[PDB]
Amino acid sequence: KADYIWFNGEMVRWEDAKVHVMSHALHYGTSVFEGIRCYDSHKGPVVFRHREHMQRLHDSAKIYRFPVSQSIDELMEACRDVIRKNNLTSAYIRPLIFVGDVGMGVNPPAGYSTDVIIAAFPWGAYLGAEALEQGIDAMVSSWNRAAPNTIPTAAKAGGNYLSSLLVGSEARRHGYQEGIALDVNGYISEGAGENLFEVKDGVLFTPPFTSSALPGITRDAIIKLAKELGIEVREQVLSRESLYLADEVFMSGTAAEITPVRSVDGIQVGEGRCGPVTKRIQQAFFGLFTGETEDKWGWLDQVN
Amino acid sequence: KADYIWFNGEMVRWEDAKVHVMSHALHYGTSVFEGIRCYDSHKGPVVFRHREHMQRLHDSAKIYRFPVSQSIDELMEACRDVIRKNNLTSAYIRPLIFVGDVGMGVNPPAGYSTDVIIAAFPWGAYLGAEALEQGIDAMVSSWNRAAPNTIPTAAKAGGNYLSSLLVGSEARRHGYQEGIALDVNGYISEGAGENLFEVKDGVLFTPPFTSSALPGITRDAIIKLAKELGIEVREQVLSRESLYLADEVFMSGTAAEITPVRSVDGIQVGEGRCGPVTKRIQQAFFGLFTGETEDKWGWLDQVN
Amino acid sequence: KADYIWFNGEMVRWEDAKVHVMSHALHYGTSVFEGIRCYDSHKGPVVFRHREHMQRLHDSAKIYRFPVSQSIDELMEACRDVIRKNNLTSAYIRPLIFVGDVGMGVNPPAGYSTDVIIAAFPWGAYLGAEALEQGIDAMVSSWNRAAPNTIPTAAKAGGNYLSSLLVGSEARRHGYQEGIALDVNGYISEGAGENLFEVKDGVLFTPPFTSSALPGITRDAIIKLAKELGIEVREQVLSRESLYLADEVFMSGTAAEITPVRSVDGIQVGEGRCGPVTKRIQQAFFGLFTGETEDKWGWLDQVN
Amino acid sequence: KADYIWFNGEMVRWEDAKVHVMSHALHYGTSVFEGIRCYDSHKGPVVFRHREHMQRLHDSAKIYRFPVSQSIDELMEACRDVIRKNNLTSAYIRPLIFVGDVGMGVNPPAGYSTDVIIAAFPWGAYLGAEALEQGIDAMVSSWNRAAPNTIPTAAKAGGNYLSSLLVGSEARRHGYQEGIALDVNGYISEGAGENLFEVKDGVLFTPPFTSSALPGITRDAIIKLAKELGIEVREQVLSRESLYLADEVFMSGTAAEITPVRSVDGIQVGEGRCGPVTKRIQQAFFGLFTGETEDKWGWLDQVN
Amino acid sequence: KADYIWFNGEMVRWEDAKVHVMSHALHYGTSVFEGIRCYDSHKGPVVFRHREHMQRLHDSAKIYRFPVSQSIDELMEACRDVIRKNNLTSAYIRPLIFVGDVGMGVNPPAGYSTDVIIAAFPWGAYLGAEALEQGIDAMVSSWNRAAPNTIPTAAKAGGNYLSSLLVGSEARRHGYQEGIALDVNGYISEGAGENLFEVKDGVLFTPPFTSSALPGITRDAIIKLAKELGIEVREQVLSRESLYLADEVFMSGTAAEITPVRSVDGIQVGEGRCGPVTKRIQQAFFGLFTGETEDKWGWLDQVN
Amino acid sequence: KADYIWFNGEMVRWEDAKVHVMSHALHYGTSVFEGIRCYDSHKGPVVFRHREHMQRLHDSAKIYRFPVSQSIDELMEACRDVIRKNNLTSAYIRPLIFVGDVGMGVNPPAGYSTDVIIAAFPWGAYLGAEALEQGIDAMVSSWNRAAPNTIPTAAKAGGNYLSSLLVGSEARRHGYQEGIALDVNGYISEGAGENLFEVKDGVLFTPPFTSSALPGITRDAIIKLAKELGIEVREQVLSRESLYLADEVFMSGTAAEITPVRSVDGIQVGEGRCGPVTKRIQQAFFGLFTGETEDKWGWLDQVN
Ligand SMILES: Cc1ncc(COP(=O)(O)O)c(CNC(CCC(=O)O)C(=O)O)c1O
Ligand SMILES: Cc1ncc(COP(=O)(O)O)c(CNC(CCC(=O)O)C(=O)O)c1O
Ligand SMILES: Cc1ncc(COP(=O)(O)O)c(CNC(CCC(=O)O)C(=O)O)c1O
Ligand SMILES: Cc1ncc(COP(=O)(O)O)c(CNC(CCC(=O)O)C(=O)O)c1O
Ligand SMILES: Cc1ncc(COP(=O)(O)O)c(CNC(CCC(=O)O)C(=O)O)c1O
Ligand SMILES: Cc1ncc(COP(=O)(O)O)c(CNC(CCC(=O)O)C(=O)O)c1O
């Protein structure tokens, strides 16, 4: 937790950041949000692919026509502002744009405005203390990801997560660390809160957005790092069983970073440990914050 | 609006009913809710199909495994309690069960509890002041309803409504009063916040739940009233074009009650006015609150 | 062929009934049509379910918003007029409403009118001189019927038949008399030019319109006749293999009347002949024109 | 209109180019056609990708097994002839091969032949006088494109256009200039009479033929011009929402040439004007008719 | 195991019932089989719905065109013989028709014949010693049932069971007793080796064959017993979540007879024990073997 | 046929290699197998891509969790052993891993083991003595391939072939030599027993595994050979009609090697003969056994 939360421009004490129970988003899933990480690097506290995240936040809101009064630059400034205000050097940031207290009825009244929050706070490995190192055990879920043209899966919206709750909770109830969901066609989509990658014969594979997968920013970074490392990348639909035949499997995400998947549905992947290509990518990723990996794309935004 | 809102057992002043901005449901659409109407009848203030609604609220929570500490009877008592406390004789009630301030991450921590709210307040015709009388103009949306086995459509959950927002807002932007959505198969599903009925050759038609339609309680009541009136009812999949060939078309819902649809995509239905069968059902429905229609199923719960 | 064709309100000799090659319908399938039969009866020449066919014609046009200047009564008089002008007592009637010479570009110019033709002529059994009596060999096509919400299959429009051509020609090229098509879901739809019926344990089955089957008027009469005969009817989705397990199988249509199907894909149906139930239904149908079957629905329109 | 139309090997006068009202294609949509443009250029009148179009015309007929007695070069010579004979230096050409007066019944009799017509005439911007410059407002339709294996969308056949009528008329009735359709999967297919392109981060995107999109000749030309300009091209499935996130959006076609799309469903694309990449491509395209763009592929067939 | 097995017309000893390892069915899953139970009753040993099973065995072979040289009565006599010869009064019978040693290559050579085997042996409760009484815990599988028109699910064929292996083994590995599978549409199909029934508000529900469910003989018997008891039955598509909302849930099958399902995916069904309606049906079922339930349909074939 | 068959570690004379009729695989399609060819070469007898085939065998088993006691090296030695024991220099090898006599009930008892067979024998061209040289006539089947996530199509398992039987037998009954199946989406999948390739404008196309196509080892070698030849390869979804527009079409498989397809559904492909590109590829393939083609990948395993 932390001392302050940026709320519609103001730095509000954490406990005072409250909204009415009749706020639209509590009843209709009408909000869009982001996950952003601030790392303690060789260059000091830096926000990873900051602009990319605020840009996606805007894109998500645009799809639903949620009015956003803050520009991308102003959102970035607020983000850096809230990190410094809480005196954090590393943290997870949660920007949230939502339809507030505007009356009942799924359709908000014409002229309404959205409320915006940006909370920063320390947050450990999404999948566990040993996850990044030893990998996790995944399970293919019995629940499928949203079908195309129902609820936009390119958008990171609150309502989307009922699905992730069903997928993620099932895996956990059965003793697994994360669930992998298939789209409505029976092909691999993504993890409950991560994108899915496969490594086969030295080539990196990952499903396209049209497989109902979120256009992950970690995913995109990985694809770019891989090309820098001379690793071929193929964005293509993947069969459910490809998970059992792949040489390596790993998940990506802002919270999950790069987490090796050592088994799927109880079937061991490779030697049951982090794969060689997964390790190259993982080191190349965390090397961005030690200076070992040259930031050629401009992904480290100085907090100050 | 009103003076009080029932909140976790307590009667809280409306303006004091607030939750933290880090409440789970604001970020992940993790809530289930209901729409219930209290009518000023010949028997005094009565809650229409009260138990049925609280039962559905419980069912929705069960599907997502949201822990609910209140029993159906206790929820009903709270509902009647909040109506009387606000001294209302007619009103719309909004029970809401949601995952509150329990930490970030789509999967709530083991042992967590849900927060529950029940707000009562006057609310007019969902589709307009002239809707019930003259009917409304509907449009078939370009957005489809959630596919089976993605997010349960039998559950009335907050996250579901991103879809209803897209469907409903599109119709309104194009000058229509409500949008009718098709499921992922191209068949009629339901309205953004209503169930859809068709009348053809004296027979009543409506899509099954498997057409991604909510198991409406108004819908169910209509099917029962129709059988009492000697009207044949067929719950079956319906083609998109059946809307243009039906003799009558109408939508049903707690907020929308029974609203005639005089046109679809600009094509006039019948004489462009309330249809004869729609009128019989509408009169039989509102007759429940004047004593004209005998309450044979026990649908009027006395508020007191 | 015959001597005269009703063309926009006037009797034109057959040979002079022509249209410009830049007629819309020739380039964009923009026409709707019907198939009607006139039968010799105890009441003299009678058109079978005349009004129902003209109503469907009107419905097909309505779906595409093709403006139709003729009323249903006017089209009915014109049809009876062409039957008499050609000195026919029995015949096949082909009404055709089509977008004419209005310019290129799929969307016709505002304020356009449609051209209308009604040709009547003798036409033998749709599937053969021995079809009604001995049955036919059918084949399940490798081409599927139009998917829901692409082109309305409840409409009888010209453009629809490219599919019928693919399905029908494939059956014929492989040695069969007619093809049966499956919908995009893999279930039985209809024949290239007729509806499909199955008989099993004394019960009659036929796919609903949502299985991409045209709402056949013959189909409808058979269902109504069957109920009179005390035969149970079930309109439901049917599996492809149900064709091989049915006790009987037959096709219905204005042109094909009631044609038994002795085999499907080379697999013999029942004894390989017109089954007993198909027989009961066929005698009841043709009985309408002898008076042996009472015309309880008012299906025989006298030509005079 | 013009003065001559090529009709079955002979240059007949416009007013004489007629066929019987009982012509097959008028009742069953059994025709295949093309759209070709003749441009006035720095080299006089030139037919754009003349052979390619006549080849597709042949390909379309082949899929439906429509017999074609003319060779590609004879059609090309006839086309060139119609342009000259009518004294046009810029025009739109419409070759049409159709099943004519061969008798009723969807299956044409063995040994029949097709009638062939080729009309040429002046035709302006398909989507408006200001289209090419300012861009147009597009709408995603509520009607879907033909599903795979129903009616081959690889072929340009008359019957295909009932769908294009529904898609295009809907957008026009709602105040847009063109409608974009999704396939039965919920992915972007194509415009009612154009192919769809998106530009994102400098890369050009367009759906594959398997997304129920016609293998456009303008589309193919653009892909080739793009690569020549060093612009990366990706033929891949695209989500419905990608239309709101693309930096640029444009439609391609013979009639529509290269038309920018400044907004989709009311959501502004980029700056609301022609984007930079669409600009380069459009200039390269029209540069062919001035010599500025070297015709490296031989896409210009001099009329003479 | 037992002492004799009927093999191609002769009662061979168990140990001699062998076929070559190059038998077609061993490599291509080309066999059709059945499951039948012989019960000890108030009338001695009786084979339940004996003829029905042998008829389905024939139907299965017919779909795949496997030649069967034995008539239904010869199979019935052989079955009765195997039971007697082995001195059993209660047992499980397994008739199996398979393509034997006819050479490699999926297509058997013209004129081949099938090998037929019929083994009888004592087999207890399919889902456990406590199944029938206490009910079992079911799990919805992550594997889907065969899609329509791929491998006919109306037939009980060997190859079909790779799917049942995946569905059933997954539930068992996760600590459940049986897995319930959804079809490719996301709707309930059937258990890995049983049909699925739900009870809601006194009405009995079960998916149709078109939901990729086998036309179970126990299922059919239950529908008939239900109607006799005045219980309404609805054969209709069912949503995945309906399993959590049903008042009662149970599985049917020859091996599993009538087994209550006390929980699905860990969610308790009703009171967590056999429900009242499942109770009535189960008693009516087993009442057949005591005389309590009058065999009104002739489902008991005395062994003698 | 031959003299000996490797059976669980020992050479058994062909005639004595038998199994009990209660062997699991005979009743539930529970086996996985391979097809391998041994060729006479300049290096003497050589098994083509031997290890790759045994690896796939292992992969097929892994997917179903069938326990396999033999290592890949052990299976390879056994295969070479049976080739020599039978005095063969060229031959077809059939390894078969199957669940044996372990009891009835789809789920085998914990701790079970699988039986393994490896038969080697001479086998002529899969599709005919003139197939490789003159090509074959193919037919698009009316039966579709297994849907994703039902039965893994990446596996070569016995149960899979019920589908291959339906597709292959249908082509053969209608006068063709092989059938081509479409997946549940309506796109080209593969032949009943081989992968499908198309050639268009010098580019080679073939469906990905997600089109329900087996990851053919011949397919893989052709793609690798093609790249050596400087031929561009595109693994992508293909439309059904693309078969009629391709310049060339051929099938690949261990048994069928490289078989040109001269016609599809009676529509001639190219000149009606082995196209030039198919030719280049075919000569490169067979060149491997003459040495004319350098074995750069290590595909020739010497039998010795
Ligand atoms: C469904 C889903 N897919 C993929 C991703 C990966 O996208 P990135 O852009 O690379 O982050 C996320 C991010 N999800 C989370 C945590 C979700 C939660 O709040 O539980 C994250 O990494 O912030 C996600 O929710
Ligand atoms: C998608 C949807 N379908 C059908 C219905 C009809 O169900 P009933 O049980 O008969 O009510 C509702 C209820 N929706 C609303 C209002 C939604 C909103 O809050 O905007 C109602 O009638 O309370 C709904 O949201
Ligand atoms: C696809 C199709 N399905 C069903 C029917 C049956 O409907 P009825 O209303 O009972 O006629 C027809 C009528 N087809 C034809 C002949 C088609 C042709 O002209 O080739 C008819 O009976 O007039 C049809 O074309
Ligand atoms: C559905 C459709 N998609 C794409 C295209 C684009 O293909 P091009 O090869 O690049 O032309 C066309 C051509 N349609 C038209 C106009 C349709 C009409 O006749 O109204 C054309 O450009 O001639 C089309 O009809
Ligand atoms: C997939 C499947 N569904 C339903 C049924 C139920 O049909 P009934 O006709 O009522 O039996 C069975 C029969 N299966 C088994 C056992 C399967 C096995 O061999 O393990 C049976 O009851 O013999 C089945 O295999
Ligand atoms: C469905 C299927 N697809 C593709 C292939 C091609 O894969 P390859 O790895 O290149 O062999 C085969 C192999 N089938 C056979 C023969 C099947 C039969 O036994 O009838 C083969 O080539 O051994 C197959 O069965």
Tab-separated table of C-alpha atoms in Angstrom, chain A residues 22-245:
chain	number	residue	atom	x	y	z
A	22	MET	CA	-23.517	3.795	-7.061
A	23	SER	CA	-20.511	4.485	-9.291
A	24	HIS	CA	-21.273	3.074	-12.764
A	25	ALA	CA	-18.162	0.866	-12.989
A	26	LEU	CA	-19.076	-1.081	-9.839
A	27	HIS	CA	-22.299	-2.178	-11.537
A	28	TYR	CA	-21.424	-2.420	-15.225
A	29	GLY	CA	-17.691	-3.186	-15.505
A	30	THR	CA	-17.273	0.173	-17.227
A	31	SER	CA	-13.629	1.010	-16.662
A	32	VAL	CA	-10.336	0.626	-18.481
A	33	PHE	CA	-7.041	0.171	-16.703
A	34	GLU	CA	-3.351	-0.528	-17.044
A	35	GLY	CA	-0.557	-2.326	-15.282
A	36	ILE	CA	2.782	-0.520	-15.326
A	37	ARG	CA	6.028	-1.257	-13.520
A	38	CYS	CA	8.616	1.142	-12.190
A	39	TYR	CA	12.025	-0.468	-11.780
A	40	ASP	CA	15.008	0.541	-9.680
A	41	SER	CA	17.604	0.612	-12.471
A	42	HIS	CA	21.183	1.650	-13.232
A	43	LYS	CA	19.545	4.903	-14.332
A	44	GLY	CA	17.473	5.165	-11.156
A	45	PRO	CA	13.668	4.701	-10.889
A	46	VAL	CA	12.303	4.205	-14.405
A	47	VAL	CA	8.821	3.473	-15.740
A	48	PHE	CA	8.949	0.650	-18.291
A	49	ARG	CA	7.304	1.461	-21.635
A	50	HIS	CA	5.347	4.213	-19.935
A	51	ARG	CA	4.022	5.986	-23.025
A	52	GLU	CA	3.013	2.660	-24.556
A	53	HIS	CA	0.882	1.912	-21.505
A	54	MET	CA	-0.837	5.282	-21.342
A	55	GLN	CA	-1.411	5.050	-25.089
A	56	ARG	CA	-3.098	1.680	-24.604
A	57	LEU	CA	-5.170	3.131	-21.753
A	58	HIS	CA	-6.396	5.816	-24.152
A	59	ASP	CA	-7.060	3.247	-26.871
A	60	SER	CA	-9.134	1.127	-24.475
A	61	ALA	CA	-11.210	4.159	-23.497
A	62	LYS	CA	-11.633	5.222	-27.126
A	63	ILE	CA	-13.148	1.864	-28.065
A	64	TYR	CA	-15.885	2.355	-25.442
A	65	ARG	CA	-16.112	6.096	-26.118
A	66	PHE	CA	-15.278	6.916	-22.494
A	67	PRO	CA	-14.405	10.646	-22.416
A	68	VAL	CA	-10.847	11.213	-21.165
A	69	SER	CA	-9.892	14.784	-20.271
A	70	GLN	CA	-6.212	13.992	-19.636
A	71	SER	CA	-3.704	13.793	-22.483
A	72	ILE	CA	-1.144	10.997	-22.668
A	73	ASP	CA	1.593	13.420	-21.580
A	74	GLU	CA	-0.497	14.635	-18.615
A	75	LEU	CA	-1.194	11.045	-17.586
A	76	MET	CA	2.519	10.257	-17.740
A	77	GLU	CA	3.314	13.311	-15.627
A	78	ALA	CA	0.711	12.279	-13.052
A	79	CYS	CA	2.188	8.777	-12.967
A	80	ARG	CA	5.724	10.028	-12.311
A	81	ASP	CA	4.244	12.501	-9.817
A	82	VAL	CA	2.499	9.798	-7.770
A	83	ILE	CA	5.600	7.583	-7.728
A	84	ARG	CA	7.756	10.402	-6.331
A	85	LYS	CA	5.048	11.514	-3.889
A	86	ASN	CA	5.063	8.057	-2.324
A	87	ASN	CA	8.859	8.041	-2.446
A	88	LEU	CA	9.026	4.738	-4.314
A	89	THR	CA	12.045	3.572	-6.318
A	90	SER	CA	10.326	0.430	-7.647
A	91	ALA	CA	6.592	-0.206	-7.857
A	92	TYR	CA	3.542	-1.420	-9.720
A	93	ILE	CA	1.295	1.354	-11.022
A	94	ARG	CA	-2.432	1.028	-11.566
A	95	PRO	CA	-3.991	3.773	-13.715
A	96	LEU	CA	-7.786	3.390	-13.830
A	97	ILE	CA	-10.291	5.375	-15.917
A	98	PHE	CA	-13.867	4.701	-14.891
A	99	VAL	CA	-17.466	5.815	-15.231
A	100	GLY	CA	-18.355	7.118	-11.794
A	101	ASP	CA	-21.458	8.421	-10.026
A	102	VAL	CA	-23.571	9.314	-13.060
A	103	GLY	CA	-26.820	7.443	-12.435
A	104	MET	CA	-28.057	3.890	-12.992
A	105	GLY	CA	-28.629	2.412	-16.440
A	106	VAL	CA	-25.840	0.933	-18.550
A	107	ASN	CA	-25.867	3.916	-20.950
A	108	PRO	CA	-24.245	6.944	-19.227
A	109	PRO	CA	-25.928	10.337	-19.674
A	110	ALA	CA	-24.722	12.552	-22.532
A	111	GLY	CA	-22.011	14.955	-21.385
A	112	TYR	CA	-20.732	12.754	-18.555
A	113	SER	CA	-17.043	12.671	-17.607
A	114	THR	CA	-14.880	9.825	-16.339
A	115	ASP	CA	-12.996	9.671	-13.065
A	116	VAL	CA	-9.312	8.785	-13.192
A	117	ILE	CA	-7.093	7.207	-10.553
A	118	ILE	CA	-3.394	6.330	-10.590
A	119	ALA	CA	-2.138	4.279	-7.652
A	120	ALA	CA	1.481	3.234	-7.158
A	121	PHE	CA	2.620	0.565	-4.698
A	122	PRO	CA	5.247	-2.215	-4.346
A	123	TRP	CA	4.111	-5.562	-5.824
A	124	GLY	CA	6.048	-8.815	-5.980
A	125	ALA	CA	6.167	-11.544	-8.614
A	126	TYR	CA	2.667	-12.141	-9.969
A	127	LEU	CA	3.023	-15.924	-9.907
A	128	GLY	CA	5.091	-16.542	-6.786
A	129	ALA	CA	8.481	-16.096	-5.139
A	130	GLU	CA	10.043	-19.004	-7.075
A	131	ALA	CA	8.187	-18.420	-10.370
A	132	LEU	CA	10.788	-16.434	-12.351
A	133	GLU	CA	13.545	-18.831	-11.326
A	134	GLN	CA	12.027	-22.337	-11.393
A	135	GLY	CA	8.965	-21.810	-13.582
A	136	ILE	CA	5.338	-22.637	-12.785
A	137	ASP	CA	2.842	-25.425	-13.492
A	138	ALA	CA	0.084	-24.380	-15.882
A	139	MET	CA	-3.305	-25.889	-16.703
A	140	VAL	CA	-5.499	-25.516	-19.795
A	141	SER	CA	-8.812	-24.106	-18.570
A	142	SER	CA	-12.319	-25.375	-19.264
A	143	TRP	CA	-13.397	-21.748	-19.743
A	144	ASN	CA	-12.871	-19.997	-23.102
A	145	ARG	CA	-11.758	-16.423	-23.880
A	146	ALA	CA	-14.226	-13.838	-25.207
A	147	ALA	CA	-15.189	-14.362	-28.853
A	148	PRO	CA	-14.293	-11.762	-31.501
A	149	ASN	CA	-16.736	-8.849	-31.789
A	150	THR	CA	-18.426	-9.423	-28.408
A	151	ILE	CA	-16.271	-7.509	-25.910
A	152	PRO	CA	-13.057	-6.104	-27.523
A	153	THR	CA	-10.097	-8.142	-26.260
A	154	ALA	CA	-7.578	-5.591	-27.531
A	155	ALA	CA	-8.974	-3.337	-24.812
A	156	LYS	CA	-7.907	-3.785	-21.205
A	157	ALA	CA	-11.275	-3.170	-19.554
A	158	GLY	CA	-12.541	-4.053	-16.102
A	159	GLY	CA	-15.483	-6.098	-17.334
A	160	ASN	CA	-13.134	-8.384	-19.269
A	161	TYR	CA	-11.787	-9.857	-16.078
A	162	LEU	CA	-14.778	-11.966	-15.084
A	163	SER	CA	-13.279	-14.358	-17.630
A	164	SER	CA	-9.784	-14.121	-16.163
A	165	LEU	CA	-11.254	-14.795	-12.724
A	166	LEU	CA	-12.916	-18.003	-13.947
A	167	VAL	CA	-9.802	-19.137	-15.814
A	168	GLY	CA	-7.301	-18.208	-13.120
A	169	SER	CA	-9.348	-19.439	-10.172
A	170	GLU	CA	-9.922	-22.843	-11.785
A	171	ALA	CA	-6.211	-23.482	-12.271
A	172	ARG	CA	-5.500	-22.453	-8.687
A	173	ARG	CA	-8.305	-24.621	-7.268
A	174	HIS	CA	-6.824	-27.636	-9.041
A	175	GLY	CA	-3.363	-26.985	-7.641
A	176	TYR	CA	-1.818	-25.158	-10.598
A	177	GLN	CA	-0.212	-21.705	-10.538
A	178	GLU	CA	-1.874	-20.312	-13.655
A	179	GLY	CA	-4.512	-21.160	-16.230
A	180	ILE	CA	-4.086	-20.995	-19.996
A	181	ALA	CA	-7.295	-20.332	-21.905
A	182	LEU	CA	-8.299	-21.353	-25.419
A	183	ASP	CA	-10.329	-19.065	-27.655
A	184	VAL	CA	-13.777	-20.080	-28.923
A	185	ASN	CA	-12.143	-21.969	-31.800
A	186	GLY	CA	-10.167	-24.322	-29.562
A	187	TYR	CA	-6.762	-22.682	-30.122
A	188	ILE	CA	-4.379	-21.197	-27.542
A	189	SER	CA	-5.302	-17.651	-26.534
A	190	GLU	CA	-3.425	-16.456	-23.451
A	191	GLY	CA	-3.023	-16.921	-19.722
A	192	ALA	CA	-5.552	-15.415	-17.302
A	193	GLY	CA	-3.307	-12.371	-16.900
A	194	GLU	CA	-0.401	-13.111	-19.212
A	195	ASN	CA	0.418	-13.719	-22.856
A	196	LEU	CA	1.618	-17.194	-23.912
A	197	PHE	CA	4.846	-18.051	-25.777
A	198	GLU	CA	6.184	-21.379	-27.089
A	199	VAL	CA	9.679	-22.294	-28.218
A	200	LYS	CA	10.123	-25.070	-30.757
A	201	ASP	CA	13.306	-25.880	-32.639
A	202	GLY	CA	14.867	-22.553	-31.684
A	203	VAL	CA	11.933	-20.518	-32.984
A	204	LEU	CA	9.663	-18.374	-30.787
A	205	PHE	CA	5.874	-18.715	-31.214
A	206	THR	CA	2.974	-16.702	-29.818
A	207	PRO	CA	-0.725	-16.334	-30.774
A	208	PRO	CA	-1.992	-13.234	-32.671
A	209	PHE	CA	-4.482	-10.750	-31.182
A	210	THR	CA	-7.188	-12.425	-33.240
A	211	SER	CA	-6.814	-15.472	-31.016
A	212	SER	CA	-8.508	-13.337	-28.367
A	213	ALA	CA	-5.174	-12.444	-26.774
A	214	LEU	CA	-4.394	-9.042	-25.256
A	215	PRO	CA	-1.831	-7.050	-27.257
A	216	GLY	CA	0.621	-7.352	-24.383
A	217	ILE	CA	3.297	-4.710	-24.043
A	218	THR	CA	5.676	-7.215	-22.443
A	219	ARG	CA	4.798	-9.542	-25.344
A	220	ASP	CA	5.686	-6.826	-27.858
A	221	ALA	CA	8.936	-6.067	-26.040
A	222	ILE	CA	9.856	-9.762	-26.092
A	223	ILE	CA	9.231	-10.012	-29.824
A	224	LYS	CA	11.549	-7.024	-30.348
A	225	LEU	CA	14.242	-8.321	-27.982
A	226	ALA	CA	14.085	-11.727	-29.674
A	227	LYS	CA	14.684	-10.174	-33.078
A	228	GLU	CA	17.631	-8.280	-31.583
A	229	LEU	CA	18.948	-11.611	-30.286
A	230	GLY	CA	18.616	-13.202	-33.715
A	231	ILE	CA	15.721	-15.429	-32.650
A	232	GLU	CA	13.046	-16.058	-35.292
A	233	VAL	CA	9.544	-15.096	-34.174
A	234	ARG	CA	6.282	-16.409	-35.589
A	235	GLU	CA	2.981	-14.864	-34.552
A	236	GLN	CA	0.508	-17.575	-35.469
A	237	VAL	CA	-2.468	-19.559	-34.232
A	238	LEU	CA	-1.373	-22.453	-32.026
A	239	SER	CA	-3.091	-25.773	-31.319
A	240	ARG	CA	-3.912	-26.810	-27.764
A	241	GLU	CA	-1.560	-29.809	-27.993
A	242	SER	CA	1.378	-27.682	-29.208
A	243	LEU	CA	1.809	-26.996	-25.488
A	244	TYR	CA	2.840	-30.621	-24.934
A	245	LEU	CA	5.250	-30.733	-27.877
